């Protein structure tokens, strides 16, 4: 709650995704105090803070609608997936299945080019 029970101006919900895309999630774990179990609460942001302190201190100008990021592994150089960073501040990824799929966490993000909304990403999984 931000007022007592009243409304409040807030950023719009993260969207919109094309048919068949999901939202990549940078997930971390927190200090939980409870007596249920050891399922550490996991909270997931849309971009790591190293990105917010980067776009807000560099001030690019978006070209068309989305960047096309490839998640090259750091040393072997293999595409783990091909995500599409919408310029409104999220990284969509064309998933298909129903269960969560966890990626390695040692991949260097890299751009390849700008790209419109209608780009049909190569599916993963």
């Amino acid at each position: 709650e931000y007022n007592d029970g009243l409304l409040v101006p807030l950023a719009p919900p993260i969207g919109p995704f094309l048919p068949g895309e999901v939202l990549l999630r940078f997930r971390t774990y927190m200090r939980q105090i409870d007596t249920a179990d050891a399922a550490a609460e996991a909270i997931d942001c849309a971009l790591p803070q190293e990105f917010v302190s980067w776009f807000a201190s560099n001030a690019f100008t978006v070209q068309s609608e989305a960047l096309l990021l490839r998640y090259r592994n750091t040393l072997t150089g293999q595409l783990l997936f091909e995500c599409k960073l919408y310029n409104e501040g999220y990284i969509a990824l064309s998933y298909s299945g129903s269960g969560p799929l966890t990626f390695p966490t040692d991949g260097i993000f890299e751009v390849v080019s700008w790209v419109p909304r209608l780009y049909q990403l190569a599916s993963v999984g």
Partner: protein, 253 residues
């Protein structure tokens, strides 16, 4: 007598527009550019698009725009000058096997056209060149500079002659495994015969027309954006709400 053939090249026709011949008086300088830029195509920034059996006929696929931001040389010389005036040339390349039928039409929409909805029967009245998704070799178009102000200004994002590409006839493959055969396509672009920037200026290195680079850091070492603890892993999941409205960690590009 006479004889009219029944298959001719496409050859979009033009009537040349003046480049640095209108804007030489009212501009301080007129700067040439390395004359070996005019001689080879090169992938634009926006040069990537994809057709696919899920694209109804009418969906605009790639909407270019005349300017120095179509050729990563001009997109890099354009930090030393304050304006550009002249023509350009674009080339697109498709990639389809002999199983995909369907045509696209690329059309040189002029400036000051109301940017709205263009139905298929309305995209071809412009100057255009119709090419289908099997063609092997590249196909090119002259992107002229129909304008009314003498010379545009880089850091202003003026309005200039676009280049639109509509899926004319619906793309559909024969029936091996379809629905998963994105026909990729790339673009490239080179300065035309009469392009040249318009006033020298210190390279400010904080300007428009610079390709975004993301910080080269593994997502393990990064600092999270909703809890003061390092990012522990990135993943996708369709189960959790796929349209959250978090407040923190929300920045545009």
């Amino acid at each position: 007598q006479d004889l009219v053939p029944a298959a001719v090249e496409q050859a979009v026709p033009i009537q040349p527009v003046a480049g640095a011949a209108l804007a030489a008086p009212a501009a301080g300088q007129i700067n040439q550019i390395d004359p070996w830029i005019f001689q080879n195509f090169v992938q634009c920034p926006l040069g990537e698009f994809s057709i696919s059996p899920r694209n109804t006929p009418g969906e605009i696929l790639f909407d270019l725009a005349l300017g120095p931001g179509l050729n990563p040389y001009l997109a890099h010389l354009s930090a030393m000058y304050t304006g550009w005036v002249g023509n350009m040339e674009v080339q697109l390349v498709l990639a389809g096997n002999a199983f995909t039928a369907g045509k696209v039409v690329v059309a040189l929409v002029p400036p000051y056209f109301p940017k709205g909805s263009l139905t298929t029967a309305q995209i071809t009245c412009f100057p255009h060149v119709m090419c289908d998704v099997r063609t092997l070799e590249p196909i090119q178009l002259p992107l002229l500079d129909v304008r009314r102000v003498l010379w545009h200004a880089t850091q202003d994002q003026e309005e200039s002659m676009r280049l639109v590409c509509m899926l004319y006839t619906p793309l559909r493959t024969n029936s091996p495994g379809d629905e998963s055969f994105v026909v990729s396509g790339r673009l490239l672009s080179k300065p035309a015969a009469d392009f040249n920037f318009v006033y020298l200026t210190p390279p400010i290195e904080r300007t428009i027309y610079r390709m975004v680079d993301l910080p080269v850091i593994q997502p393990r070492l990064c600092t999270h954006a909703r809890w003061p603890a390092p990012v522990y892993g990135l993943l996708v999941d369709p189960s959790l709400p796929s349209n959250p409205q978090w407040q923190n960690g929300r920045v545009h590009v």
